[PDB]
Ligand binder design. Structure first.
Ligand SMILES: [Zn+2]
Lengths: 444, 480
């Protein structure tokens, strides 16, 4: 596989050089990205192979600039002739677009000319038959857990490697390799004329960082069985815990609200909040783009800009926007290396377990799953479908579904009571469960 | 028809009909029920205006072949981002390994049959000049800004695709399509006394960009849509808190048809029902909606975003009655699930591209009109919501819970529409909510050409539709 990957890497590097050279005579600047992803995706049904999918995807993207006019083109064909056509397409477009001085290649002084090795590449030679056996093991462990499990949506195993190369007309040309492997199962349980489905999974850059198939199956069944016989709450106001998985998404809404694109367009409810307290004064959000093997580690952003260790929130204070080249120029600032998103967020727990948070809350709603969109970028208004558990006397009483929770993110974030030690570790943003003092719950 | 696509996809890439025979033969060396070869090329453009200038433009090209081998429940799948004999051979040889056992090698002779055309074969990317395309956007910007002094920002985009497909299969299917699709999107920001809000409009379909300059009720369509985005932004700017709880909800005609897409649409896709994982599994012949409700999925509609002259397996699009006077009639199928359920293809076998597997997917999903006027429906509510527009939604087909979120909504008080209210997510159970439909309007319309549907990571263009209707009890996710 490493001979295959090194061969792909050389091909991609030449493709970037070729595109940049073809552009150089007819543009003031150009940026070129190429990627290749290869691997396998398999599923099982009742422990037998269902699907075997062989994946092989490639792509080349180019943006060129002339008189501050921009044009872009892309192709999945990396032959020299296809590259020539893609370059000419982008150049032709830039004859019709308008001069826009905030457009252009990222600032030379911010580029990752010598990009760090973040050890993202841990390939595995997994045959389809071996992949199938892993999926089957996870699914069978789920199906054997309890006699109320009566159907399946299957086991699934995925293993891929990727090569990405970026270059631009300031002389940057840097590339890196990565791997991702994952294993999941999803089953259906029934009780008293009600069906429920849930899943469990494990993910990592190295095969030896995964949970066992049998762990996945046990987790899948536990989650699925816990959903049985839900109640629809009556309409009320109560405290709400966002369980760790959805709590990561609660902090996730911050990304849109502090993105430079939203800020310069005045389309964020946090427009006037830079340097002000938006979160509790003990809460810090640490960004760590250079974690070795990190799930969202990156040696540079999508415009080739260096990434840095940053405290996005420090002691409840919003310290910075998330800027790209274009939005930074619009605001008179410099890129913070956030083209393409955020790069590993970490929020520490304040010392309580999940069980202790339930005791602290006493009576209230725990949300474990949210449905729908219902979050306004410009106002912060929040209205989402929810499922979870009702808590009374500090103990889970029954599952709940067919309800909504509503409020405003500005209020929700400012008034967080505590964050748990039960940290979710499979995601970009990693935190524990989050206690909110009050939300409007719509139901019966 | 087939000829033109076959020259572009096969002949231009050094392939003939007999190469198709040979590759399908390679698949049939194993013990399969079915195998297919799916050829595609597509060309996508987009242009974006913001801050009164043309900021961005893009041109995107894709091409490839996907090859499937199917045996009962099982699919092997491989593909390549090129159209060549070697790509075909490599793909077929990988995909057939789904089963180890030898097959009888029997395949039906390849034979194309006529289908009805549903949209032009003229390339929309080439049929209008770039200067005229960009003038559509400039017009949108000018009209929006002239509509109200509070308009501070307008983003307007034009997006077009031209797509050629050819499918050849072991059951003798040989079919081709030429698929145009265009979309105009408008978003506006309004400001008053330091408060800001946004509004949006747009649509399109399977035709050229000239559609945006044609007449809509006595005005130029793009002017009308520019004005609509401004109107929506101004409604939202004035909106007050929505009420929380269970109440009557009156849904407008058209895009509020998202109701159907979420509450029944996905639940009636044959893959979920074959597996027994949908709440509708085994329920054919039962009352799954009020007796006032007839719900169809219709791939035959001339020029529409959601239509399929052929689906991605070569099956001509069909008018499929799913629910008739409240009674479940059947499911949307692809070839695989049809065989496994002992049913027949319905024209719902769709894939995002050559690089993805087809499955049962919606086309244009709507409710047939009834006898009530929209005014009668509004007048019947003492206290509730009127919601003439929505964003998107979501459904859990197993537990039968679904949501959809309002983008324009109002209180109804004493049978009159009163105060505009803020965006709220509405939640219910699919079958139970459909059973609460007590009034069905005489004013059926489909959406303007905006639908995007997701399933298993695959995005597709869809349509939805309905008349004005009344749900007697639905949970509204307000704060007040
Ligand atoms: Zn959908």
């Amino acid at each position: 596989v490493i001979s295959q990957v090194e061969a792909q890497r050389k091909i991609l590097e030449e493709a970037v050089s070729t595109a940049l050279e073809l552009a150089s005579g007819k543009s003031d600047g150009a940026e070129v990205a190429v990627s290749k992803t290869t691997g396998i995706s398999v599923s099982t049904r009742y422990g037998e192979v269902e699907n075997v999918e062989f994946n092989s995807d490639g792509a080349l993207g180019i943006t060129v600039y002339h008189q501050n006019r921009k044009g872009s083109a892309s192709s999945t064909d990396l032959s020299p002739q296809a590259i020539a056509r893609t370059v000419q397409a982008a150049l032709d477009i830039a004859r019709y677009t308008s001069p826009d001085p905030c457009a252009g290649v990222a600032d030379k002084e911010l580029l990752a000319f010598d990009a760090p090795d973040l050890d993202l590449f841990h390939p595995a030679e997994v045959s389809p038959d071996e992949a199938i056996e892993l999926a089957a093991r996870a699914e069978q462990a789920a199906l054997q857990a309890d006699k109320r499990i009566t159907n399946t949506e299957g086991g699934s195993f995925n293993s891929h490697y990727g090569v990405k190369v970026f270059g631009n007309s300031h002389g940057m040309l840097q590339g890196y390799c990565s791997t991702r492997h994952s294993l999941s199962s999803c089953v259906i349980a029934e009780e008293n004329g009600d069906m429920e489905r849930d899943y469990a999974y494990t993910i990592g850059r190295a095969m030896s960082d995964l949970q066992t198939p049998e762990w996945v199956g046990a987790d899948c069944a536990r989650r699925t069985l816990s959903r049985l016989s839900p109640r629809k709450l009556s309409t009320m106001k109560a405290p709400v815990i966002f369980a760790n998985e959805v709590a990561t998404g609660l902090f996730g809404h911050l990304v849109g609200a502090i993105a430079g694109g939203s800020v310069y367009r005045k389309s964020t409810f946090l427009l006037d909040s830079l340097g002000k307290q938006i979160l509790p004064d003990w809460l810090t959000i640490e960004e760590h783009p250079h974690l070795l093997k990190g799930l969202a580690s990156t040696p540079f952003d999508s415009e080739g800009v260096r990434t840095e260790r940053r405290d996005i929130i420090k002691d409840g204070i919003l310290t910075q926007w998330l800027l790209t080249s274009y939005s930074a120029r619009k605001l008179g600032l410099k890129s913070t290396g956030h083209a393409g998103g955020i790069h590993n967020w970490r929020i520490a727990g304040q010392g309580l377990s999940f069980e202790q948070m339930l005791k602290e809350m006493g009576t209230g709603l725990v949300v474990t799953e949210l449905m729908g969109q219902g979050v306004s970028a410009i106002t912060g208004d929040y209205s989402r479908g929810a499922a979870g558990f009702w808590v009374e006397n500090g103990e889970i009483q029954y599952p709940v579904s067919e309800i909504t929770i509503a409020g405003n993110l500005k209020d929700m974030w400012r008034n967080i009571v505590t964050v748990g030690n039960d940290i979710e570790t499979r995601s970009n943003i990693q935190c524990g469960s989050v206690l909110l003092p009050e939300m409007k719950i719509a139901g019966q | 028809s087939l000829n033109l696509v076959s020259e572009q996809l096969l002949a231009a890439n050094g392939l003939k009909h007999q190469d198709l025979f040979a590759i399908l033969g390679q698949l049939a060396e194993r013990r399969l029920d079915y195998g297919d070869l799916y050829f595609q090329s597509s060309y996508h453009e987009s242009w974006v205006l913001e801050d009164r200038i043309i900021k961005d433009g893009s041109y995107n090209i894709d091409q490839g072949v996907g090859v499937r081998a199917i045996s009962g429940e099982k699919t092997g799948f491989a593909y390549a981002d090129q159209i060549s004999l070697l790509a075909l051979e490599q793909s077929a040889q990988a995909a057939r390994t789904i089963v180890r056992d030898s097959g009888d090698g029997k395949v039906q002779t390849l034979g194309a049959v006529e289908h009805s055309p549903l949209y032009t074969s003229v390339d929309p990317l080439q049929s209008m000049s770039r200067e005229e395309k960009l003038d559509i956007l400039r017009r949108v910007d000018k009209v929006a800004r002239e509509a109200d002094k509070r308009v501070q920002e307008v983003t307007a985009s034009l997006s077009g695709v031209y797509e050629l497909i050819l499918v050849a299969a072991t059951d003798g299917t040989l079919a081709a399509d030429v698929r145009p699709l265009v979309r105009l999107s408008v978003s506006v920001l309004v400001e008053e006394d330091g408060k800001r809000e946004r509004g949006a409009s747009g649509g399109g379909g399977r035709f050229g960009y000239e559609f945006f300059l044609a007449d809509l009720d006595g005005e130029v369509r793009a002017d009308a849509w520019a004005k609509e985005a401004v109107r929506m932004a101004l409604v939202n700017l004035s909106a007050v808190a929505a009420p929380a709880g269970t109440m009557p909800v009156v849904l407008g005609a058209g895009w509020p048809g998202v109701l159907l897409h979420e509450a029944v649409g996905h639940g009636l896709e044959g893959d979920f029902n074959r597996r027994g994982t949908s709440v509708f599994s085994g329920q054919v012949g039962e009352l799954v909606a009020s007796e006032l409700c007839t719900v169809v999925d219709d791939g035959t509609m001339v020029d529409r975003r959601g239509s399929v002259a052929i689906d991605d397996e070569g099956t001509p699009g069909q008018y499929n009655v799913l629910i008739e006077n409240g009674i479940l009639k059947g499911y949307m199928q692809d070839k695989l699930n049809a065989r496994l359920m002992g049913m027949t293809p319905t024209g719902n076998g769709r894939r995002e591209s050559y690089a993805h597997l087809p499955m049962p997917r919606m086309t244009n999903t709507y409710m047939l009109p009834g006898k009530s006027t929209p005014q009668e429906i509004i007048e019947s509510v003492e206290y509730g919501i009127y919601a003439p527009n929505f964003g998107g939604g979501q459904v859990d087909i197993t537990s039968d819970k679904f949501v959809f979120s309002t983008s324009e909504a109002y209180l109804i008080e004493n049978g009159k529409v009163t105060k505009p209210v803020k965006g709220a997510t509405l939640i219910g159970s699919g079958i139970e909510t459909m059973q609460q439909i007590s009034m069905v309007g005489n004013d059926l319309k489909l959406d303007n050409g905006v639908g995007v549907c997701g399933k298993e990571g695959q995005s597709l263009p869809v349509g939805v539709g309905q008349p004005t209707l009344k749900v007697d009890n639905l949970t509204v996710g307000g704060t007040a």
